[PDB]
Write a protein that binds this ligand. Structure first.
Ligand SMILES: C=C(C)[C@]12C[C@@H](C)[C@@]34O[C@](Cc5ccccc5)(O[C@@H]1[C@@H]3C=C(COC(=O)Cc1ccc(O)c(OC)c1)C[C@]1(O)C(=O)C(C)=C[C@@H]41)O2
Lengths: 551, 104, 131, 71
């Protein structure tokens, strides 16, 4: 009750700065305001009263409690309308849009650049009720923006990084709303907001369209490059198997198998010529100098190419695991031939190591076939899980027992690694010549050998049960999604082209006239087709088609 | 039936990858051998004896180097251990998601 | 369910009869307040009930769980540490770690007032462990 | 859970001190007046904060707080 007489005392005093438009001053709640409290206390009536007294509907709460990454902080953007949107109060939003005094504008941005839709994406994490609330609020706010302002398209407004809510929705790993945005159909009063159509439905077969305005890699900074080279969430492999992405990636992958096979064959020819040069190292000097020039140009080519890749798209281990090996291998080969032309007498182990590393690095191209593609993904999952920590523990055991045997040995067991070789050759079954007889006690070394054997058996058995534990409690529909993601990475890399050859890449999808805009000209979009078979079509009514005759 | 299912699922991938490993390491060892490692067949025989446990290893010590040879043999044994573990866990993943009616 | 019902109602009746007595503070012959006995014997659900217990307005002081402030979806809850903190000798944590004998000692540590507390102490004393 | 338990035993043993130095420990948590006790004085207790997030708060009800202003 006292508020309107208190505001009346504020008005009748003749204040130059009014009381209701006043900000908190601390660092923690910087720029907080009365209207945010009125909204958060679930009161429609006090919001109405404060709007009648002249409250600022653009009070930017830019404080330290309103940042994303501080502990126990609530991010909603800074706008009051954003707060009423996030807190699921519909009529408050409707009053803030349709009040007669100081109307709200959806095009307004926070100090961080986010509008109401961006922050509404930011607050959705995971549930049934959270995702249903977020999707319903999103669609209702789009319809209200459509009836409020026909001027601008609201989803076109970018962030400070340059993101529309689709792109940022994929970047932050929000999946359910992202699925909802990629397949979204509205009704007849405003159908021009939708993205999905039906071209024709001839009984149980139907052809759906999808718009690709920011999904195709022809446009700069697409959702594809954001999923591949910018998304850090561990749920990216669920974000690839969606409906209008799968048809596009299948079409592009079957469109550009032959460049993949061609580059694979050229790399095989490279390694065969390198094999001949490494075997006939030892007239024939013409072929040897041709081998010098050929391996030099190939190593220069691949070293510069992977250096250019490492410079282009990097901003962290297993995803980028493949390219690092080729970069190191090409550096090793070019350094080996550089020291060889320098004649530095170090070039033979570098040459043999480069040959080994190059033939081991051929398993990059096992991703074309699924039967070895799943196998290579399992190799990477072995490489991430147990190998590093297990090798560290094994080095602890090895170094301890080797120094023990060295200090026990007073002409076998001469040095540290010269006995560490005996200790490792003992684990596979080539250990020999016990009872060294240079000291009285050899049962010491007997018990050391028993201890080392039993503990290494324990460690291998622990690595086995760790691999079984990590592999059994994971869905079978995971490695296939990882394979589809890795194919997506590779096909976008090949669509980028060569580094010495900038390709004139092409648009995908058919351009057609999807409908009419509410302002004049007909809406024409680029679209991707997808067929579908549904035997439950006779329960529901038939949807609105574009062309009746199936083309 | 499980013999046929295992040979059908493992051979045409695993022996191919393992063959790439053996051939690369054998050509590397013959190259790094400047009477041990006499021919390519004997070198592949030695490198498979290390998979049986009969390979006789020593320092080269008047050659290119010795520890390079040693570290390459280390890498061979550890990577084949990796691949055998991979074949095991793939067969266990195929065994885990199965039904008791199917083999019958 | 019957135990938490009888326990809360019996504490309310003890509040209504004699206010000067503090009933959850009386030790046994082993020297144990009943929360500590519930921790030592390895009884789970009643212990979880006692650690987070809230009551209505006529008896506020019996309750242990307090809300500092609630602002929309985020909330700040206060827990009491009258017998939980290891500052005093013979705390509940000291009973769990050392003096107990139950086979479910790992199950009781993931509870609400212990989890963030051990989180805070461990992150406060990482560097001397590394030292 | 077993990892949490072993970490708990370790952090308690390191909090106790080593053998040649028994150290006066530190209390943890915030001390404040929570409410009023029915016998005279207000309730004065030590507290620990936990900040938690939940989305069913609208259809459910809000309870009474200790401080109206968040701080
Ligand atoms: C980056 C890692 C993880 C790595 C880099 C080098 C040092 C490597 O040693 C390791 C550690 C190691 C050593 C010995 C046995 C197992 C693991 O394994 C690979 C790495 C282990 C081998 C085999 O590589 C693989 O794991 C398979 C593989 C290669 C390339 C791929 O794109 C790939 O994905 C499909 C899989 C290649 C080496 O370069 C090789 O043959 C020599 C000379 C050293 C090997 O480190």
């Amino acid at each position: 009750a006292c508020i309107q007489p208190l505001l009346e005392i504020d008005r009748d005093s003749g204040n130059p700065q009014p009381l209701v438009n006043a900000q908190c001053t601390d660092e923690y709640y910087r720029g907080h305001s009365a209207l945010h409290i009125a909204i958060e206390k679930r009161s429609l009536q006090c919001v109405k009263l404060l709007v009648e007294n002249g409250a600022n509907v653009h009070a930017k709460a830019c404080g330290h409690f309103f940042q994303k990454n501080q502990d126990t902080c609530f991010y909603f953007g800074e706008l009051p309308l954003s707060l009423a949107a996030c807190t699921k109060q519909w009529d408050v939003v409707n009053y803030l849009l349709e009040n007669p005094h100081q109307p709200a504008s959806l095009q307004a941005q926070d100090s961080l650049g986010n509008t109401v839709l961006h922050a509404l994406v930011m607050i959705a994490d995971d549930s049934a009720e959270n995702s249903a609330l977020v999707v319903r609020m999103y669609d209702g706010l789009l319809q209200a923006g459509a009836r409020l302002c026909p001027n601008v398209q609201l989803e076109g407004i970018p962030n400070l990084e340059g993101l529309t809510p689709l792109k940022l929705a994929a970047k932050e790993g929000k999946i359910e709303i992202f699925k909802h945005i990629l397949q979204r159909e509205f009704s007849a009063p405003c159908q021009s907001l939708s993205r999905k159509f039906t071209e024709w439905c001839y009984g149980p077969v139907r052809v759906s369209l999808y718009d690709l305005a920011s999904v195709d890699s022809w446009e700069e900074n697409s959702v594809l490059e954001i999923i591949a080279f910018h998304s850090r969430s561990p749920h990216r492999h669920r974000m690839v198997v969606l409906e209008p992405l799968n048809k596009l990636l299948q079409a592009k992958w079957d469109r550009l198998i032959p460049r993949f096979c061609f580059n694979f064959l050229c790399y095989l020819v490279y390694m065969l010529i390198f094999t001949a040069v490494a075997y006939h190292q030892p007239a024939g000097n013409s072929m040897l100098l041709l081998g010098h020039i050929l391996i030099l140009l190939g190593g220069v080519y691949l070293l510069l190419g992977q250096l250019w890749y490492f410079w282009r798209r990097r901003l962290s281990f297993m995803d980028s695991y493949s390219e690092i090996l080729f970069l190191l291998q090409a550096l090793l080969t070019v350094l080996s031939q550089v020291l060889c032309f320098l004649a530095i007498e170090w070039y033979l182990p570098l040459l043999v190591s480069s040959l080994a590393m190059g033939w081991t690095n051929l398993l990059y191209y096992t991703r074309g076939f699924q039967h070895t593609g799943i196998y290579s993904v399992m190799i990477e999952k072995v490489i991430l899980r147990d190998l590093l920590r297990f090798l560290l523990v094994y080095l602890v055991f090895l170094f301890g027992f080797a120094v023990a045997l060295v200090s026990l040995s007073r002409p076998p067991y001469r040095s540290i690694l010269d006995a560490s070789l005996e200790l490792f050759k003992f684990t596979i079954g080539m250990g020999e010549l016990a009872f060294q007889e240079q000291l009285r006690f050899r049962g010491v070394v007997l018990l050391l050998l028993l201890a080392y054997v039993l503990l290494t058996y324990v460690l291998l058995l622990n690595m086995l049960i760790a691999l079984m534990s990590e592999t059994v409690n994971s869905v079978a529909t995971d490695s296939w999604s990882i394979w589809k993601l890795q194919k997506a990475i590779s096909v976008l890399e090949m669509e980028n082209g060569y580094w010495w050859c900038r390709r004139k890449k092409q648009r995908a999808g058919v351009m057609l006239t999807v409908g009419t805009r509410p302002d004049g000209s007909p809406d024409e979009r680029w679209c991707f087709r997808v067929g579908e078979m549904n035997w439950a079509t006779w329960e529901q009514t038939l949807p609105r088609t574009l062309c009746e005759e199936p083309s």
